[PDB]
Amino acid sequence: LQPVTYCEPAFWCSISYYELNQRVGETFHASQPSMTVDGFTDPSNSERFCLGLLSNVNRNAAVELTRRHIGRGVRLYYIGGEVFAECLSDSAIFVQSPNCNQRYGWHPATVCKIPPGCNLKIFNNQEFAALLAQSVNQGFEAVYQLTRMCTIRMSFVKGWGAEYRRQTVTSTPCWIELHLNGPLQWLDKVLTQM
Amino acid sequence: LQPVTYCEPAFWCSISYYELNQRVGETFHASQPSMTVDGFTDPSNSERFCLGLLSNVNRNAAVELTRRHIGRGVRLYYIGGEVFAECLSDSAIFVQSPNCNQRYGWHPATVCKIPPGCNLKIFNNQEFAALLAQSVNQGFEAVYQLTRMCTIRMSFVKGWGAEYRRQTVTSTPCWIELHLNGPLQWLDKVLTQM
Amino acid sequence: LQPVTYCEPAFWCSISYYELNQRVGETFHASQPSMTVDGFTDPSNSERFCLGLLSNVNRNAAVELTRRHIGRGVRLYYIGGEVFAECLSDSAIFVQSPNCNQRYGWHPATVCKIPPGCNLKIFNNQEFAALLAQSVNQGFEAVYQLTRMCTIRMSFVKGWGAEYRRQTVTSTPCWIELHLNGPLQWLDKVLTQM
Amino acid sequence: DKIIHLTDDSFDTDVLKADGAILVDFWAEWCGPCKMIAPILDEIADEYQGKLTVAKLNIDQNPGTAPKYGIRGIPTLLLFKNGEVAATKVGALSKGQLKEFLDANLAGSGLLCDLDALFQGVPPNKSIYDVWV
Amino acid sequence: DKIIHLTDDSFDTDVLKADGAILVDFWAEWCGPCKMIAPILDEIADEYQGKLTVAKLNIDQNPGTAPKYGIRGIPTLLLFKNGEVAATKVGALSKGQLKEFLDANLAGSGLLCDLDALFQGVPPNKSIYDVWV
Amino acid sequence: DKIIHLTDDSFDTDVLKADGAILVDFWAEWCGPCKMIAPILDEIADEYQGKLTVAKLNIDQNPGTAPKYGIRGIPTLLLFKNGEVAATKVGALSKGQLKEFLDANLAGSGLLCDLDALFQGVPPNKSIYDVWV
């Protein structure tokens, strides 16, 4: 097995917006170290993913009401191989990051509530490197499973999980999915050898 | 409240194509002052949004038949803070532009028929500025409502409304939605302060 | 009728990925003469369309299992007005190319199995030119029909057709659609005159 | 009968502080065309129950209200919505012209905060020639 | 029985100006392999009702038709569709080979304006080796 | 009763080569807090049927097993899954604390090849303050 390189892509992540179980709008490709995802309407900002201007033909009254509460949303930033999330909104955000959950010994599917004003490291490249190393030893099937470890899901305003009426993320009105391109590229250099 | 700037983005609008209630194809970002949306098949033209080459797995016979009649379609252009629509098709086009409806004192949801050969100003930046000024005074909830005032919906060939068998725009086989980025950016500078 | 030009666009094709009857991920625009579509996870490669990193909220266990077998997938390349497909995967790929079927006198809807290691010319520009010439003579309705002749559908691992449990392409778990931009542009120069 | 007969004293409560939309008719015993619409108002008052209240103010017996809203001629119809003047229609008109007037302005509110209410129904249609060209 | 027996005179009407697809058999009393397919044609004529008409033209009694279409040997089958020659099959063949021939060419029309009709069903399958490699 | 009583000899078969998850209790007759959890284990053994087996190993009668896994104090609970030590819980605890321990670690396997099994249910919730800040 040839050792991979911990290089970083130009775009450190991709963000896709959902309402319930439906994709809404196009994918946003983050080229800036620090950015926000908010409920406002600027269309031409490389540092802002504005969800407010996004149309959805099948949107219900509930979803519209929740969108109104996104506000300043979440600030996402990338520093020294680490990704952070800051809740700028006046409502909480809920994050499901297996890489984050691992760091605390939590269930990998854990949904963590980030209240307004709070900051949370939602990814660390080295933790993923450690997991990738364990997978190589455990075989190929274990390595394929690591794809979802490169993904993070985040819900605005409304929580989901065992403690909420909404049991799954596709039952929340406003959520996003993050793909971390660096780990995906690293994963790829392993996958294509095994 | 800090006064906003009536600046214009590089891309003056975004166009999304629909069939019935389904998104079809990718979004087209207008960078040219004058452009067309037609039923032909050029894939590499910044001045043409060709709908003819777009695939839709769930397309029915009706939709296919209507697509055949789009023809030269609509010419959309941007001059001195104003947006115009010209019906190039041999069939009519139907436009729902609240900003246009306002100019004539029409119901804001009014669908207006533009027959072949006819030209219609479908947006004026100053009318929107006037409305935005009234919203600031009426509060924040009024300002959020202005998002749809930055959008225009247009149907090819088939009309919809109280006078047609099709009551809603998602019952027409071929329609587009325009987002006007300038007004959206202006709206955003207000939203983020309130 | 003014003679068209057999010029080639910058992007020689566009590829859209599907699972069953649902679009998954964004469209990939081929700018390179030789490229692959595989089941791995590199996000930043102009020569690779990696399907492994693509999320689908409505994905079932079957689709996930089949994705695992895409492997190195298909190599697609463009040489001297001809397009080829090479099965790099350890499983077969199935191609429906009317332009290819024409070359062999097959039913235009024929699905052809390409087993691992095998190479197949899936498009030839001149065959299309011949067909386009016959259409001009047969009238406008015949020319509109040629749009689908600019498209190719390809399924990974699972076959479809009269010999398989899956009767239609939207019943296969992993397939792509290719739009050949050159023929589409040529078709367009004819369509806009007729 | 379901038609409120306003006075200058009762105009404040019955119209400005009223729930929903109120159609106020300004008429007089000498207004010819005012008597033309008088039976039409009864039909409107009964057909638009629950969504519109028809009110009449005799300007002879009540001379204070009309000038305040700039009513200089009759018949004159003011459509009131939550204290404001929503729409106005002047002169004699047919039952059909009155329905078209009502249907187009029973928007509700009081916008822009309730502008969404105008897109939750079936949109009306115009031709580009309806601009009169 | 549902098999048309053509003549040189009736060939124009019964074949060229006929609705749907017509399978024209060119045979003679001395053609050995022509008698081989003769019972097969009867089975085809009955199983392909409503979508195909089976017609036979004896070239001895009717010598004018065969050379016009370049028929130089028999048995020879011409599949006619709306006046045109759609497909052709030459020599003796089995019932299975005849079905495979028919199934692949009952496309209908007369394309390209009806090319869509070829994608509104269940597609047939080939292997890359079926090109014979 | 559904509680296996292990020995040093039978520990290999009953635990390491066992199907599913096995909860192994290390206890002694002199362990005060060990008797506290003893009735709790019975309730757990009956409520977690089909998904968990409760096993007890007396370390006095069986002194060989405990040091091999580094068990230096009791009560000590080792959760075994397919031969490996999945999770461990030390000291006396309530029935609720035992359920929270079990619910969080009955992941199954033996990952990472079965990591998908952890996302096919309803996810648990934490607050950022649960990190204790």
From Swiss-Prot, chains A, B, C:
Outcome reported for the amino acid change (mutating K158R): Greatly reduced acetylation and 85% reduction in transcriptional activity. Completely abolishes acetylation and 97% reduction in transcriptional activity
Recorded consequence of changing K158Q: Increased transcriptional activity. No further increase in transcriptional activity with EP300
Cellular compartment(s): Cytoplasm; Nucleus
Occurrences of domain MH2 (ranges): 12-194
Region annotated Sufficient for interaction with XPO4, chain positions: 51-104
Domain of life where this protein originates: Eukaryota
Disease: Colorectal cancer: A complex disease characterized by malignant lesions arising from the inner wall of the large intestine (the colon) and the rectum. Genetic alterations are often associated with progression from premalignant lesion (adenoma) to invasive adenocarcinoma. Risk factors for cancer of the colon and rectum include colon polyps, long-standing ulcerative colitis, and genetic family history. Loeys-Dietz syndrome 3: An aortic aneurysm syndrome with widespread systemic involvement. The disorder is characterized by the triad of arterial tortuosity and aneurysms, hypertelorism, and bifid uvula or cleft palate. Patients with LDS3 also manifest early-onset osteoarthritis. They lack craniosynostosis and intellectual disability.
Function description: Receptor-regulated SMAD (R-SMAD) that is an intracellular signal transducer and transcriptional modulator activated by TGF-beta (transforming growth factor) and activin type 1 receptor kinases. Binds the TRE element in the promoter region of many genes that are regulated by TGF-beta and, on formation of the SMAD3/SMAD4 complex, activates transcription. Also can form a SMAD3/SMAD4/JUN/FOS complex at the AP-1/SMAD site to regulate TGF-beta-mediated transcription.
Protein name: Mothers against decapentaplegic homolog 3
Chain's gene name: SMAD3
UniProtKB/Swiss-Prot annotation, chains D, E, F:
UniProt domain Thioredoxin: residue ranges: 1-107
Family annotation (CDD domains): TRX_family
PROSITE patterns per UniProt: THIOREDOXIN_1 (PS00194), THIOREDOXIN_2 (PS51352)
Keyword Secreted attached: no
One GO-annotated biological process of the protein: cell redox homeostasis
GO molecular function, one term: DNA polymerase processivity factor activity
Active site: C31, C34
Gene Ontology CC terms: cytoplasm; cytosol
Modification sites for N6-acetyllysine: K68
Keywords: Acetylation, Disulfide bond, Electron transport, Host-virus interaction, Redox-active center, Transport
Family indicated by similarity: Belongs to the thioredoxin family.
Name the UniProt record assigns to this protein: Thioredoxin 1
Source organism per UniProt: Escherichia coli (strain K12)
Lineage per the UniProt record: Bacteria, Pseudomonadati, Pseudomonadota, Gammaproteobacteria, Enterobacterales
Encoding gene per record: trxA
